[PDB]
JSON list of C-alpha atoms and ligand atoms in Angstrom, two decimals:
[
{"chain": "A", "resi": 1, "resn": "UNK", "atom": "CA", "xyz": [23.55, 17.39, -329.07]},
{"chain": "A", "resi": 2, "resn": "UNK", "atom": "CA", "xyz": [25.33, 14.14, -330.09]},
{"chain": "A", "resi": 3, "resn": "UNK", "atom": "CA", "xyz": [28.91, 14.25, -329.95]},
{"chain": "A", "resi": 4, "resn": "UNK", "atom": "CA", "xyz": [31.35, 11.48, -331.69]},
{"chain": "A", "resi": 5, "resn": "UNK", "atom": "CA", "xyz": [34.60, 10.70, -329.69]},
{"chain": "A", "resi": 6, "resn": "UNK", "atom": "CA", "xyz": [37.30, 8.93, -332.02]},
{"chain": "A", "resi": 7, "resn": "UNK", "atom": "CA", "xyz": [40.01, 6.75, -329.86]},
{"chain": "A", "resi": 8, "resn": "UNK", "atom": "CA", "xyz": [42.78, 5.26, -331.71]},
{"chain": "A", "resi": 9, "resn": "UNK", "atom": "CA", "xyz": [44.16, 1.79, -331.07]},
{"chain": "A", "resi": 10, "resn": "UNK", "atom": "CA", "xyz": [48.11, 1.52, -331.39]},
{"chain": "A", "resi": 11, "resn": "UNK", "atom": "CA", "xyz": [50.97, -0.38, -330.13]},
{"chain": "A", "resi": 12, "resn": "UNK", "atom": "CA", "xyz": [52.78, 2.88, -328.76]},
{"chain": "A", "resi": 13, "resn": "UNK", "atom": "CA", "xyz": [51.44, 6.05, -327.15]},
{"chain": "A", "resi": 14, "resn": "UNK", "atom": "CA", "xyz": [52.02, 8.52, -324.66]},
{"chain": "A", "resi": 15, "resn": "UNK", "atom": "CA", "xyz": [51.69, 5.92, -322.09]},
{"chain": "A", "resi": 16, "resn": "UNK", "atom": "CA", "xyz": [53.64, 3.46, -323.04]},
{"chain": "A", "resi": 17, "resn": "UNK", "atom": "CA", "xyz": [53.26, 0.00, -325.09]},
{"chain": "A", "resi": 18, "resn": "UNK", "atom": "CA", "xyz": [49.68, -1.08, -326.22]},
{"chain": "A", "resi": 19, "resn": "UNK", "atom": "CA", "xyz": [46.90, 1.64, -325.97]},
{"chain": "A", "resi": 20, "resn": "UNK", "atom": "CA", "xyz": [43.60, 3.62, -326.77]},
{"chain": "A", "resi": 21, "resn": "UNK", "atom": "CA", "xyz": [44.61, 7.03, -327.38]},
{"chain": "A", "resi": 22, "resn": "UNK", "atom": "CA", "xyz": [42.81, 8.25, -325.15]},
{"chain": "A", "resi": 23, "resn": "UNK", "atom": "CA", "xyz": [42.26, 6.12, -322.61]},
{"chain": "A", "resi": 24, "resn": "UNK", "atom": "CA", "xyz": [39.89, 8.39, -320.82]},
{"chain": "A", "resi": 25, "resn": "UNK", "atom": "CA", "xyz": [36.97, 9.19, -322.44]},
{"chain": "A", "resi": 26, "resn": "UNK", "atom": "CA", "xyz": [34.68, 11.86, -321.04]},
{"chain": "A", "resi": 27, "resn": "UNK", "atom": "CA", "xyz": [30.95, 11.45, -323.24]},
{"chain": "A", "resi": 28, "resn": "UNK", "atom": "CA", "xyz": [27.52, 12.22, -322.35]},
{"chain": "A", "resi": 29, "resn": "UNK", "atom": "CA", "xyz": [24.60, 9.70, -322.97]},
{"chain": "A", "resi": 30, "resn": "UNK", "atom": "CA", "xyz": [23.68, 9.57, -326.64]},
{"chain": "A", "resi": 31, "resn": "UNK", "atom": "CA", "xyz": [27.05, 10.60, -327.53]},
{"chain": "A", "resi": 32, "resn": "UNK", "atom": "CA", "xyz": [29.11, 7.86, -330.07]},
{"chain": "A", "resi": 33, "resn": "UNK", "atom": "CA", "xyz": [32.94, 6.43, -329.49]},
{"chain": "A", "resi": 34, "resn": "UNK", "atom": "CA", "xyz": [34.35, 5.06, -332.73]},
{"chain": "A", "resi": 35, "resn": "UNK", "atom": "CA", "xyz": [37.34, 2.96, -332.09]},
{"chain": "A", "resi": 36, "resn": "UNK", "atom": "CA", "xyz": [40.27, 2.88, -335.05]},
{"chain": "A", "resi": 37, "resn": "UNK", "atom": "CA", "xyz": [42.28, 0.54, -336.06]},
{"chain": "A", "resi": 38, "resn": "UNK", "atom": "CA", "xyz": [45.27, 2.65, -336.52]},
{"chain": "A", "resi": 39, "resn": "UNK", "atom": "CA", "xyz": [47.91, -0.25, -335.83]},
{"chain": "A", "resi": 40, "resn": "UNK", "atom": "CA", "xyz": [46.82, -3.75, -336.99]},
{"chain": "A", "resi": 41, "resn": "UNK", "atom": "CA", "xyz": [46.21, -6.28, -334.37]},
{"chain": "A", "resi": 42, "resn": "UNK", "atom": "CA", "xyz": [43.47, -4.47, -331.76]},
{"chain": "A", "resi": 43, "resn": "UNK", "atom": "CA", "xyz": [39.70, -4.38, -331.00]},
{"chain": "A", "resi": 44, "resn": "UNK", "atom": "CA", "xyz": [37.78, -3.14, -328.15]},
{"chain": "A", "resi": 45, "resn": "UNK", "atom": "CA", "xyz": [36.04, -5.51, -326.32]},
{"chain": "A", "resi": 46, "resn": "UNK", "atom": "CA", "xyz": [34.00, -4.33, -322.90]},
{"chain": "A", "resi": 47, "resn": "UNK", "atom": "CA", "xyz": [34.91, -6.29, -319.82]},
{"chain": "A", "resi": 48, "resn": "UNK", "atom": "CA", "xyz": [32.48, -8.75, -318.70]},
{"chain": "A", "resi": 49, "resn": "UNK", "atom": "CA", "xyz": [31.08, -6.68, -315.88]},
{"chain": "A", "resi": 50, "resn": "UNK", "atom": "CA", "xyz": [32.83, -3.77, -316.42]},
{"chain": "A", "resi": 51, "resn": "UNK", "atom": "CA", "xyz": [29.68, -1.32, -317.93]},
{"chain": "A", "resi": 52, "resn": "UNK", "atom": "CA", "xyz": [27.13, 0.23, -316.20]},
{"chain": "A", "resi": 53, "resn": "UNK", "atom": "CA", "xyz": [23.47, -1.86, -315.01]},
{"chain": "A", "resi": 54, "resn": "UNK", "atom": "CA", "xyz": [21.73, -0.81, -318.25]},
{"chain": "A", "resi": 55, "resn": "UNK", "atom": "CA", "xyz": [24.57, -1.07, -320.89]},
{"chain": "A", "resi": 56, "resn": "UNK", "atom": "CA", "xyz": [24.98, -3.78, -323.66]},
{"chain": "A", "resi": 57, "resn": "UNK", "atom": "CA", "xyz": [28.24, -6.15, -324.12]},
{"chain": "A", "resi": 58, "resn": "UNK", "atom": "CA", "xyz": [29.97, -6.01, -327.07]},
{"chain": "A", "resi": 59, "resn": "UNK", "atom": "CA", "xyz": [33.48, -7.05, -328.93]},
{"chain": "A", "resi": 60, "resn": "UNK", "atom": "CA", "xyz": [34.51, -5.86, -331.90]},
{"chain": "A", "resi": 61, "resn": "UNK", "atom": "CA", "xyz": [36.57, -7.68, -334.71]},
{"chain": "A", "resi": 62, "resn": "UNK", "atom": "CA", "xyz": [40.54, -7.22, -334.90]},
{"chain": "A", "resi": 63, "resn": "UNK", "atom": "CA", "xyz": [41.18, -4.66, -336.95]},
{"chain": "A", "resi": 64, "resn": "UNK", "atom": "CA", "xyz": [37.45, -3.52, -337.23]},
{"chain": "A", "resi": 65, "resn": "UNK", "atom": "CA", "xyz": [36.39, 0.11, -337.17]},
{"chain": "A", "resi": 66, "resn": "UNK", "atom": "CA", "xyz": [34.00, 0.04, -334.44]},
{"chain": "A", "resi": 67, "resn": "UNK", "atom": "CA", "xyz": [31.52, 2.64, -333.21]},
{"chain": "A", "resi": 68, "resn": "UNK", "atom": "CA", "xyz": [29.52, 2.26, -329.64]},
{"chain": "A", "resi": 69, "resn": "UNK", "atom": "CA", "xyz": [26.51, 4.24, -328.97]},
{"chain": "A", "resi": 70, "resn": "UNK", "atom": "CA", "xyz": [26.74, 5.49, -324.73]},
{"chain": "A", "resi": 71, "resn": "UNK", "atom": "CA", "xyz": [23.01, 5.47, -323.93]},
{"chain": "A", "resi": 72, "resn": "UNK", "atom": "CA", "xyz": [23.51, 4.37, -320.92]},
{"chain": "A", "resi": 73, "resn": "UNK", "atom": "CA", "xyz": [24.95, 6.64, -318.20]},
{"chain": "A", "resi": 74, "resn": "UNK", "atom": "CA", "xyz": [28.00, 4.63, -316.04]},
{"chain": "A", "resi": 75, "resn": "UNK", "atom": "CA", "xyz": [31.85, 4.01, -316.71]},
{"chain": "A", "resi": 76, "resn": "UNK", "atom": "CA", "xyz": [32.73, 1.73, -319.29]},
{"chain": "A", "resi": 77, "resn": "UNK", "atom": "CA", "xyz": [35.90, 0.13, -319.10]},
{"chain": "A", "resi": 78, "resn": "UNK", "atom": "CA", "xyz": [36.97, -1.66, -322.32]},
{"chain": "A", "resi": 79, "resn": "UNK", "atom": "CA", "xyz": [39.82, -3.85, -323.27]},
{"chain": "A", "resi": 80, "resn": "UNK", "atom": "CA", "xyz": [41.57, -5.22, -326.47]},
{"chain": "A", "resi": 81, "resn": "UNK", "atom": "CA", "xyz": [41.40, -8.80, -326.48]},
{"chain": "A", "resi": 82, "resn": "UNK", "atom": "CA", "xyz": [44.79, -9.79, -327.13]},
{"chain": "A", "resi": 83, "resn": "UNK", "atom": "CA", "xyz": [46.38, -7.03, -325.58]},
{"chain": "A", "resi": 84, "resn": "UNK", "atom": "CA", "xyz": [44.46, -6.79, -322.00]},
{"chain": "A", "resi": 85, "resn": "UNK", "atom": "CA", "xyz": [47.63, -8.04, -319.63]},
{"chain": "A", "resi": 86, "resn": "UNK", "atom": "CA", "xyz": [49.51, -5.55, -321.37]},
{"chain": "A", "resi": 87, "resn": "UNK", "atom": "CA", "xyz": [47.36, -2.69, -320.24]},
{"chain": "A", "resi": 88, "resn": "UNK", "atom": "CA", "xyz": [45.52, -1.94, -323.07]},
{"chain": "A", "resi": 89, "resn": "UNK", "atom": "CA", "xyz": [42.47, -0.71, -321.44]},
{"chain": "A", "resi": 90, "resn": "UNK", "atom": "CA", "xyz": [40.20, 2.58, -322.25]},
{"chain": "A", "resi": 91, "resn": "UNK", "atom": "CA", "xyz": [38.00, 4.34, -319.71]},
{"chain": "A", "resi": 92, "resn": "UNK", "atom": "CA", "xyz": [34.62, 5.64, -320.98]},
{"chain": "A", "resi": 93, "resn": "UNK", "atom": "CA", "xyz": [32.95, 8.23, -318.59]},
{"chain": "A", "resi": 94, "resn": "UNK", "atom": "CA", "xyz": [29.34, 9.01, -319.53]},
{"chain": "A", "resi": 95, "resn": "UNK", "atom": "CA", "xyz": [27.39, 11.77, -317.54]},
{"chain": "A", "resi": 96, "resn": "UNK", "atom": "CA", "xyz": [28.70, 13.03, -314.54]},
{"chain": "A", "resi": 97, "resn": "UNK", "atom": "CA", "xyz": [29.89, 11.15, -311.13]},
{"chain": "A", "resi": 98, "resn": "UNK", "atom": "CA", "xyz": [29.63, 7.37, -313.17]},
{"chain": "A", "resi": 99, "resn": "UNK", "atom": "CA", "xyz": [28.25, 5.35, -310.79]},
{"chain": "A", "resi": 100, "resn": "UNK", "atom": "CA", "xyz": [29.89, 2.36, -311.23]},
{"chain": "A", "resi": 101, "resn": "UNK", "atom": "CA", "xyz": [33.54, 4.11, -311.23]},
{"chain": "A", "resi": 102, "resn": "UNK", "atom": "CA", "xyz": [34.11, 2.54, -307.60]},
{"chain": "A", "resi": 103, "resn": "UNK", "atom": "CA", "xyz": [32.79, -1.02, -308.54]},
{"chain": "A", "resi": 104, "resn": "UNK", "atom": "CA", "xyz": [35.27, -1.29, -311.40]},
{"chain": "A", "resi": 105, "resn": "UNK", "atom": "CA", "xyz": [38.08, 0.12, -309.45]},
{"chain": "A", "resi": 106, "resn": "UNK", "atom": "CA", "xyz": [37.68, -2.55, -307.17]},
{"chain": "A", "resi": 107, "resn": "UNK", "atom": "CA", "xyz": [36.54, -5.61, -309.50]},
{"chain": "A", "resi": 108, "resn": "UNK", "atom": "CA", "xyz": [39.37, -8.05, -310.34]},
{"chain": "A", "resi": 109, "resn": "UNK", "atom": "CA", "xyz": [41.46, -7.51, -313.09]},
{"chain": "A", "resi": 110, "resn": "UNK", "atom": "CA", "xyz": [45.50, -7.97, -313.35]},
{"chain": "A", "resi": 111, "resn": "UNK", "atom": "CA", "xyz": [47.47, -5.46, -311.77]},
{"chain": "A", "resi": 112, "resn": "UNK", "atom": "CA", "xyz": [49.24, -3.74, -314.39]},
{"chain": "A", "resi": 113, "resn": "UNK", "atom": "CA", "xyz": [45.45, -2.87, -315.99]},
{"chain": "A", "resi": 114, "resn": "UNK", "atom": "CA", "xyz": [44.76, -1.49, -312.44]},
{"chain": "A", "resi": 115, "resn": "UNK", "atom": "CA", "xyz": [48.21, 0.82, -312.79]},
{"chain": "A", "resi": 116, "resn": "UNK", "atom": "CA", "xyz": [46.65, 2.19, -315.94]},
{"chain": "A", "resi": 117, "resn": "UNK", "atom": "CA", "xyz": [43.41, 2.60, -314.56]},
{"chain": "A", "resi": 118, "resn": "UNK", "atom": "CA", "xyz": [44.03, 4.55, -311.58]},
{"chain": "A", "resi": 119, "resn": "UNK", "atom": "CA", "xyz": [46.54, 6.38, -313.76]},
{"chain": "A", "resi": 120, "resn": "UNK", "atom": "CA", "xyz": [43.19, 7.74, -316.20]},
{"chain": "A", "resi": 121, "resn": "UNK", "atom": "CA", "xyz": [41.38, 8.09, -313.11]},
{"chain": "A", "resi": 122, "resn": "UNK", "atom": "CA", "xyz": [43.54, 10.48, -311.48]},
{"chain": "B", "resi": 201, "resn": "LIG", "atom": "S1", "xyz": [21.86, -5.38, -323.71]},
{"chain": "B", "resi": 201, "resn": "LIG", "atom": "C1", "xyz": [22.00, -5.34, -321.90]},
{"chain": "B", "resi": 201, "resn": "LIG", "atom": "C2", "xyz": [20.89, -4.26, -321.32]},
{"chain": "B", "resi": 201, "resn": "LIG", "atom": "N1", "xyz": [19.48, -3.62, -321.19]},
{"chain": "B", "resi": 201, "resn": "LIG", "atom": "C3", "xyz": [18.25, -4.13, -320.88]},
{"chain": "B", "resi": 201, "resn": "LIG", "atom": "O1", "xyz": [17.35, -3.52, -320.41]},
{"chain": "B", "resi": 201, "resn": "LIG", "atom": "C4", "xyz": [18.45, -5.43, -321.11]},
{"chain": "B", "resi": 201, "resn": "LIG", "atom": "N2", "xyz": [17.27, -6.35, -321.02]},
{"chain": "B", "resi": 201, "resn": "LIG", "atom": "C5", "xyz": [17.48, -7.72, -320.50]},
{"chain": "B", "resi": 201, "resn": "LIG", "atom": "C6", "xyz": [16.28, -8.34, -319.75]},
{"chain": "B", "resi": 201, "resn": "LIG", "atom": "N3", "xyz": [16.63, -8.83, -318.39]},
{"chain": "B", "resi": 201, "resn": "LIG", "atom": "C7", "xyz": [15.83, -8.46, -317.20]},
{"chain": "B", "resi": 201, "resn": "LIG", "atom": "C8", "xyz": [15.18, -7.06, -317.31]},
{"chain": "B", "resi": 201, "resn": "LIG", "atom": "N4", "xyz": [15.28, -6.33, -316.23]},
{"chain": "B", "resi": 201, "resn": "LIG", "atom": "C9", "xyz": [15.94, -6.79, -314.88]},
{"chain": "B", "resi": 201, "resn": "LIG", "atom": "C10", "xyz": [17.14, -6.02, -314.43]},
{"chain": "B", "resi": 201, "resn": "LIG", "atom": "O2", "xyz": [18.31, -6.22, -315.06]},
{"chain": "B", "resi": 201, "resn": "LIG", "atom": "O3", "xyz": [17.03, -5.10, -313.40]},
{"chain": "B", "resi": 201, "resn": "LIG", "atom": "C11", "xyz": [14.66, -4.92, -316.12]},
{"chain": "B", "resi": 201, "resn": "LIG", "atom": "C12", "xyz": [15.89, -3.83, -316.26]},
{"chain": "B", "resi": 201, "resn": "LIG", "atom": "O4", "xyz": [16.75, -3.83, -317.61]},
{"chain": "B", "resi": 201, "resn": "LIG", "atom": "N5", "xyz": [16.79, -3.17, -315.55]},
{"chain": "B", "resi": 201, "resn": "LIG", "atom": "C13", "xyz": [18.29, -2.83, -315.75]},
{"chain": "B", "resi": 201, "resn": "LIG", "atom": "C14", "xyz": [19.76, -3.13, -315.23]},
{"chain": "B", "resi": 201, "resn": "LIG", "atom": "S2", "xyz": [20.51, -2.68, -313.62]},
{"chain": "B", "resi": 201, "resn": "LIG", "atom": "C15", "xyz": [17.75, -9.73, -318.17]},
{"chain": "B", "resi": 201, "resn": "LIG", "atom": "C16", "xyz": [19.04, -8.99, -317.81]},
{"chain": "B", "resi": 201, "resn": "LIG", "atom": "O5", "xyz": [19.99, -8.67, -318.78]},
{"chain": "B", "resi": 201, "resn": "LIG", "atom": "O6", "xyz": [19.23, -8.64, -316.52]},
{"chain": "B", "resi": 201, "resn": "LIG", "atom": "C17", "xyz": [15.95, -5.93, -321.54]},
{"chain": "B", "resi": 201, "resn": "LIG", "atom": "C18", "xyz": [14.95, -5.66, -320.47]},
{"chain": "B", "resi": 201, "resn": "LIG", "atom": "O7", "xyz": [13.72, -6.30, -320.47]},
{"chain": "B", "resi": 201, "resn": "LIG", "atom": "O8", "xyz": [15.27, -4.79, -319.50]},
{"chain": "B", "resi": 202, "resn": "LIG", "atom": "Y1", "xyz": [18.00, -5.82, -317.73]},
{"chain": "B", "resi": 203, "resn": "LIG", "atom": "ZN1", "xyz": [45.65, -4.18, -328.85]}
]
């Protein structure tokens, strides 16, 4: 029962400046995330270890419509390029408990991406 999960990219949201709307996204595996262009000037990009054991890198184009298939179950947390420092970040959650949720909690990454994160999380 594939689901699609469309996530905008904009320079203002709910949360603030620079964002996936939303920034939590709760999939199972199989399901598809298509990420949209809706300002001009993002992409999503995953962060280099920042996907589950299993999972495939990728980085979309700026401006691109981009779709990623979830196969594999895990967190996924993705970043636009130019707009990473800024926060603009989006948490993808597939299957329950993702195993990997601690690991990227605690991998490096700049602090006001961790705000944002723990923000989602909770
Ligand atoms: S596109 C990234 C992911 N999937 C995949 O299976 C990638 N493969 C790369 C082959 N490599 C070693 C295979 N391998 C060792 C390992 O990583 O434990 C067996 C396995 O994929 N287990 C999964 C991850 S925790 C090199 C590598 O990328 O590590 C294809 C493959 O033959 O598995
Ligand atoms: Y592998
Ligand atoms: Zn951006």
């Amino acid at each position: 029962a594939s689901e699609n999960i469309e996530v905008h990219m904009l320079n203002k949201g709910a949360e603030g400046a620079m964002v996936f709307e939303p920034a939590y996204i709760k999939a199972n595996p199989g399901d598809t995330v298509t990420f949209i262009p809706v300002d001009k000037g993002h992409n999503v990009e995953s962060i280099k270890d920042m996907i589950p054991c299993g999972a495939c890198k990728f980085k979309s184009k700026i401006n691109e419509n981009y779709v990623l298939t979830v196969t594999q179950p895990g967190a996924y947390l993705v970043k636009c390029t130019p707009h990473y420092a800024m926060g603009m970040i989006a948490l993808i959650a597939v299957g329950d408990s993702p195993a990997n949720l601690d690991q990227i909690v605690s991998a490096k990454k700049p602090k006001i991406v961790q705000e944002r994160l723990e923000k989602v999380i909770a």
